[PDB]
Design a protein around this motif. Sequence first.
Motif, PDB file in Angstrom:
ATOM      1  N   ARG A 129      11.554  26.803  -7.987  1.00  0.00           N
ATOM      2  CA  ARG A 129      12.109  27.743  -8.956  1.00  0.00           C
ATOM      3  C   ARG A 129      12.041  29.176  -8.449  1.00  0.00           C
ATOM      4  O   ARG A 129      12.953  29.967  -8.709  1.00  0.00           O
TER       5      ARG A 129
ATOM      6  N   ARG B 235       3.372  19.999  -9.105  1.00  0.00           N
ATOM      7  CA  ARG B 235       3.590  21.188  -9.920  1.00  0.00           C
ATOM      8  C   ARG B 235       3.805  22.417  -9.045  1.00  0.00           C
ATOM      9  O   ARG B 235       4.705  23.232  -9.301  1.00  0.00           O
ATOM     10  N   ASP B 236       2.989  22.561  -7.996  1.00  0.00           N
ATOM     11  CA  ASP B 236       3.143  23.708  -7.109  1.00  0.00           C
ATOM     12  C   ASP B 236       4.503  23.702  -6.428  1.00  0.00           C
ATOM     13  O   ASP B 236       5.147  24.752  -6.305  1.00  0.00           O
TER      14      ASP B 236
ATOM     15  N   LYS C 286       0.826  -1.200   0.000  1.00  0.00           N
ATOM     16  CA  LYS C 286       0.000   0.000   0.000  1.00  0.00           C
ATOM     17  C   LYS C 286       0.862   1.252   0.000  1.00  0.00           C
ATOM     18  O   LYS C 286       0.504   2.259  -0.622  1.00  0.00           O
TER      19      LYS C 286
ATOM     20  N   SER D 182     -10.543  15.878  -2.211  1.00  0.00           N
ATOM     21  CA  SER D 182      -9.282  15.164  -2.054  1.00  0.00           C
ATOM     22  C   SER D 182      -9.316  13.736  -2.579  1.00  0.00           C
ATOM     23  O   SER D 182      -8.621  13.421  -3.549  1.00  0.00           O
TER      24      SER D 182
ATOM     25  N   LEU E  68      -5.173  19.857 -14.891  1.00  0.00           N
ATOM     26  CA  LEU E  68      -5.454  19.692 -13.471  1.00  0.00           C
ATOM     27  C   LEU E  68      -5.472  21.026 -12.749  1.00  0.00           C
ATOM     28  O   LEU E  68      -6.209  21.189 -11.772  1.00  0.00           O
ATOM     29  N   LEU E  69      -4.678  21.989 -13.209  1.00  0.00           N
ATOM     30  CA  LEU E  69      -4.708  23.316 -12.605  1.00  0.00           C
ATOM     31  C   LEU E  69      -5.868  24.141 -13.144  1.00  0.00           C
ATOM     32  O   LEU E  69      -5.661  25.258 -13.621  1.00  0.00           O
TER      33      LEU E  69
ATOM     34  N   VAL F 291      14.764  29.747  -5.914  1.00  0.00           N
ATOM     35  CA  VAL F 291      16.025  29.823  -6.642  1.00  0.00           C
ATOM     36  C   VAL F 291      16.188  31.190  -7.290  1.00  0.00           C
ATOM     37  O   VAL F 291      17.272  31.785  -7.260  1.00  0.00           O
TER      38      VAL F 291
ATOM     39  N   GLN G 212     -10.295   8.068   0.487  1.00  0.00           N
ATOM     40  CA  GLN G 212      -9.845   7.721   1.834  1.00  0.00           C
ATOM     41  C   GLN G 212     -10.280   6.297   2.191  1.00  0.00           C
ATOM     42  O   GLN G 212     -11.095   6.065   3.085  1.00  0.00           O
ATOM     43  N   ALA G 213      -9.735   5.341   1.442  1.00  0.00           N
ATOM     44  CA  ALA G 213     -10.109   3.935   1.572  1.00  0.00           C
ATOM     45  C   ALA G 213      -8.962   3.172   2.227  1.00  0.00           C
ATOM     46  O   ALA G 213      -8.112   2.578   1.565  1.00  0.00           O
ATOM     47  N   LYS G 214      -8.949   3.185   3.560  1.00  0.00           N
ATOM     48  CA  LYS G 214      -7.932   2.473   4.333  1.00  0.00           C
ATOM     49  C   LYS G 214      -8.547   1.204   4.920  1.00  0.00           C
ATOM     50  O   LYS G 214      -8.967   1.160   6.077  1.00  0.00           O
TER      51      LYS G 214
ATOM     52  N   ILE H  22       2.110   8.421  -6.856  1.00  0.00           N
ATOM     53  CA  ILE H  22       0.982   9.146  -7.428  1.00  0.00           C
ATOM     54  C   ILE H  22       1.107   9.154  -8.946  1.00  0.00           C
ATOM     55  O   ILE H  22       2.069   9.696  -9.502  1.00  0.00           O
ATOM     56  N   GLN H  23       0.125   8.549  -9.622  1.00  0.00           N
ATOM     57  CA  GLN H  23       0.035   8.549 -11.085  1.00  0.00           C
ATOM     58  C   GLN H  23       1.330   8.075 -11.742  1.00  0.00           C
ATOM     59  O   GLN H  23       1.760   8.617 -12.763  1.00  0.00           O
TER      60      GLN H  23
ATOM     61  N   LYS I 126      -6.469   6.576   6.747  1.00  0.00           N
ATOM     62  CA  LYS I 126      -5.175   7.195   6.480  1.00  0.00           C
ATOM     63  C   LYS I 126      -4.777   7.020   5.017  1.00  0.00           C
ATOM     64  O   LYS I 126      -4.142   7.898   4.433  1.00  0.00           O
ATOM     65  N   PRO I 127      -5.148   5.882   4.432  1.00  0.00           N
ATOM     66  CA  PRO I 127      -4.884   5.638   3.018  1.00  0.00           C
ATOM     67  C   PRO I 127      -5.711   6.611   2.191  1.00  0.00           C
ATOM     68  O   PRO I 127      -6.928   6.453   2.063  1.00  0.00           O
ATOM     69  N   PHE I 128      -5.047   7.613   1.617  1.00  0.00           N
ATOM     70  CA  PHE I 128      -5.752   8.770   1.083  1.00  0.00           C
ATOM     71  C   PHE I 128      -6.250   8.538  -0.338  1.00  0.00           C
ATOM     72  O   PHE I 128      -7.385   8.898  -0.666  1.00  0.00           O
ATOM     73  N   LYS I 129      -5.410   7.959  -1.195  1.00  0.00           N
ATOM     74  CA  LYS I 129      -5.710   7.814  -2.622  1.00  0.00           C
ATOM     75  C   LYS I 129      -5.884   9.187  -3.277  1.00  0.00           C
ATOM     76  O   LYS I 129      -6.888   9.471  -3.932  1.00  0.00           O
ATOM     77  N   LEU I 130      -4.898  10.063  -3.073  1.00  0.00           N
ATOM     78  CA  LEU I 130      -4.952  11.408  -3.638  1.00  0.00           C
ATOM     79  C   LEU I 130      -4.946  11.371  -5.159  1.00  0.00           C
ATOM     80  O   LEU I 130      -5.912  11.786  -5.809  1.00  0.00           O
ATOM     81  N   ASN I 131      -3.851  10.888  -5.747  1.00  0.00           N
ATOM     82  CA  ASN I 131      -3.700  10.760  -7.195  1.00  0.00           C
ATOM     83  C   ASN I 131      -3.896  12.113  -7.888  1.00  0.00           C
ATOM     84  O   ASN I 131      -4.844  12.341  -8.640  1.00  0.00           O
ATOM     85  N   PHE I 132      -2.965  13.019  -7.596  1.00  0.00           N
ATOM     86  CA  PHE I 132      -2.874  14.254  -8.359  1.00  0.00           C
ATOM     87  C   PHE I 132      -1.433  14.749  -8.390  1.00  0.00           C
ATOM     88  O   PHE I 132      -0.650  14.521  -7.462  1.00  0.00           O
ATOM     89  N   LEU I 133      -1.098  15.419  -9.485  1.00  0.00           N
ATOM     90  CA  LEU I 133       0.166  16.113  -9.629  1.00  0.00           C
ATOM     91  C   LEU I 133       0.054  17.597  -9.306  1.00  0.00           C
ATOM     92  O   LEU I 133       0.994  18.352  -9.584  1.00  0.00           O
ATOM     93  N   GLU I 134      -1.075  18.029  -8.737  1.00  0.00           N
ATOM     94  CA  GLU I 134      -1.249  19.438  -8.400  1.00  0.00           C
ATOM     95  C   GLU I 134      -0.171  19.904  -7.432  1.00  0.00           C
ATOM     96  O   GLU I 134       0.511  20.913  -7.672  1.00  0.00           O
ATOM     97  N   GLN I 135       0.006  19.173  -6.334  1.00  0.00           N
ATOM     98  CA  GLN I 135       0.994  19.572  -5.345  1.00  0.00           C
ATOM     99  C   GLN I 135       2.411  19.452  -5.887  1.00  0.00           C
ATOM    100  O   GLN I 135       3.284  20.236  -5.502  1.00  0.00           O
TER     101      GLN I 135
END
Lengths: 362, 386, 124, 17
Positions: free
Chosen positions: C56, C49-50, A283, A336, A328-329, C59, A339-341, A290-291, C38-47
């Motif tokens: 940068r 990229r930010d 897990k 979010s 995505l932006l 820098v 939340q499947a734990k 992520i992806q 706790k297992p979030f399953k976020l699955n995004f590249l948003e954070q």
Amino acid sequence: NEIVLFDTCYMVCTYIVCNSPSGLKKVEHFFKNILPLHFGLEKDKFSIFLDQVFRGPAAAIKASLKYPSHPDSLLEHQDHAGDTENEMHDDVDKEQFGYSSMYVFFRLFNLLYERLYELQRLEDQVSIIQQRIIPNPVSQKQKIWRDRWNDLSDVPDEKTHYENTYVMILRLIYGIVDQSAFEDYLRFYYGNKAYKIYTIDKLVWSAAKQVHHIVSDGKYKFVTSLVEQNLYRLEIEKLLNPDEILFRFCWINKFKSFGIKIMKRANLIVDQSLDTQRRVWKKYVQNYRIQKLTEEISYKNYRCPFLCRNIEKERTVEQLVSRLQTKLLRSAELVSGLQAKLCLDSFKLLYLPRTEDSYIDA
Amino acid sequence: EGINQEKCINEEYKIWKKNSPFLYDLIITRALEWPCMSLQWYPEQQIFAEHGYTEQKMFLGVRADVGKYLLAVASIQLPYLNQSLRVNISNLYSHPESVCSAKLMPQDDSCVATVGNYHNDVLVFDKESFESYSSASESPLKPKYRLTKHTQPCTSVCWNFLSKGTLVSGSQDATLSCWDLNAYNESDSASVLKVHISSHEKQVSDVRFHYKHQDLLASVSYDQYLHVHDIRRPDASTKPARSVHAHSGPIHSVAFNPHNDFILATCSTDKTIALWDLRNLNQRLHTLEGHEDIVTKISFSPHEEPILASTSADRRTLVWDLSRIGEDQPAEEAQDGPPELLFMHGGHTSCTIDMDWCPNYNWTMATAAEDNILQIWTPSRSIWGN
Amino acid sequence: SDHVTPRYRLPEKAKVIRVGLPRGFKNKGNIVIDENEKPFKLNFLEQIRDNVINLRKMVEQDEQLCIETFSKFDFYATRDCELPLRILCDVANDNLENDDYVLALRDLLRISKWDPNQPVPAPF
Amino acid sequence: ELDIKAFVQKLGQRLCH
């Protein structure tokens, strides 16, 4: 160094055409179509430079063994012309996908290129060592000086010491002068500083072996066709092989740079303790990755759950992720996650009743 | 091999999640308390302009455990922007008497006919029954109508679109029952029983009345057959007006295209969509293939003519169109699917039990799975922009 | 940690004792075995990229400040070898000069005589 | 200033690999 690059290619093709008459048509096909696709060299002029020895002047070239005449500059590019200061942008002009049998070949090609280049760079050390080995008048008058030039065999007469050493390498490859005579030539001219050319024969033989394996291995026609047919990620991670690694090759023209990257690596052997390992390890990977393609065991069924026609056709798959990031932006409310734990059973994926996912896109 | 299957489904869900943006233009996934059994939108809604959204009403059939079945109403809040978005459930009416499927009268907004796994026939609930039902009533809700004649648990229910109080129910005992409510009585169910179709020796799979005719009734039966007949004749109780051996594998679903009186369609176990017309009932007007496993339920788009969605058990669900049949297909892209293949959906972790289209919001599909997953989705306008 | 413990010897019948004293346990530094409890399953590249854009930006600001403080880094770090020559030749007492004179005294190993002068201690 | 920003961006383009 276009000279050194052409010399490397000439050496490999010459060794193939000399020591291996079989598979000659297929090696022509490879060196003439597949390699330019990755190196961006000029097609027709590379063709002239290669059939300068590929088709006649084997006994004729065996006897002659002259330096291969070089054409003018070879440069191929798409509709990208112009460069200015502070905006010297770049692009991956040619991006191909390949496997281990081709990765090893590019590595051996680079070794050979580096060693021929370093050999060229010893032109001044040649004169230094020649000045170092110079007769002593007292020894000459004592009649004990034995010159060293009277041991070398027929030395070629080209313009550059690098060209002479190159003709000697070709002689060794064809099989005229033995290893002792070759090393003695190298020691007379380059002292003890050219010790990397000694195994050039083994190096070229390994490169030719990998070429033959690439062109006539178990899936040779299949992989060569899927390469030569023409945006290819899910069009390249579908086939199966004996546990190989997938590679991405990129060529940049404004800098003359070649890049090798490792993509997803094929799955390893399954184990029996995975049932107890999943509680902590599985897990972690599946969620923190992520992806990104998780790689523990995936061989069996990977029916792509989306048609490839729905995705907007695009080149340079590197920018497809930029397109996804831009998407995505955007206006997605984007709650979010689920939340499947639940892995207490460790047999299936379970969810929580709340924690929906909102308007994922827009 | 079970863990290998689980990991395969996990991986495909992950890749589908990642590629969601390119795929869809609306995705709303919500989990539930227990695996659902059925879902149907409501033909009405409300519009809230003070923020710019729309509230949709949903009927849902979900079972907690064996015996106890929950009927509930959901509210789907979705935006009026395309030229918090969220669903919320309520009124979890419990029923220890199993009621596996349900269907609402297109006329009466509360006359709901339900069929189950214990009861051999149908139970009709109504608004006054709901309101009379108290919260502290541990006993189930008494359905205003108890339409019960058969012996084995009924299979499929369907009201007519052109007539009031006219229902059909095909049961497990290889029989069908047409019921009329205009002559309802309190102690005689045979009276409300209009016709008794005992024509096929095999159990019917799906039943449906025609959209543009009061009397045409079509039904597919486990003998791989499709029979269309009329209620008015008594000889229909013995033989159908026209029955055809449709497919080879056990027939599963059938429907009309409510935009066209002639498009009949059905689906079976041989991975095939069979389209037929009211003119040539002898030969299959068209055969469609492309699935991977057994299919379960098909439905056209109740808002557009050429669209036909089809579920299956291979954890996918596809959206075909008829208008593009016969058109060419360039080879460099053809390798993925047939040319009439329009869109596909693979965002679940189990089979797709039940699906529906939101009536007035085209291209909006609600579907439910066994992992308590309930997705309201809508593909990109780019993939079908005409 | 066994590199800096004083070596000891345990008998080969040594029941590991779990000491209950919560605080203040004299233990000879070395004989404390693994401190067992706790297992979030976020699955995004948003954070992602930010975070890349934030890196940068940090820098960019750092480079801006540094490349403005050029043209003074040069003067105060590259001519720093000739100002010591000034404060040596024209003997002006600064802390580092006096430390160098201490260094020369410690090399010559004086005892009790008078310090000669600033330019005449003779490890020349 | 903007020149230093352009330099950082050009460095990123030149060494993004």
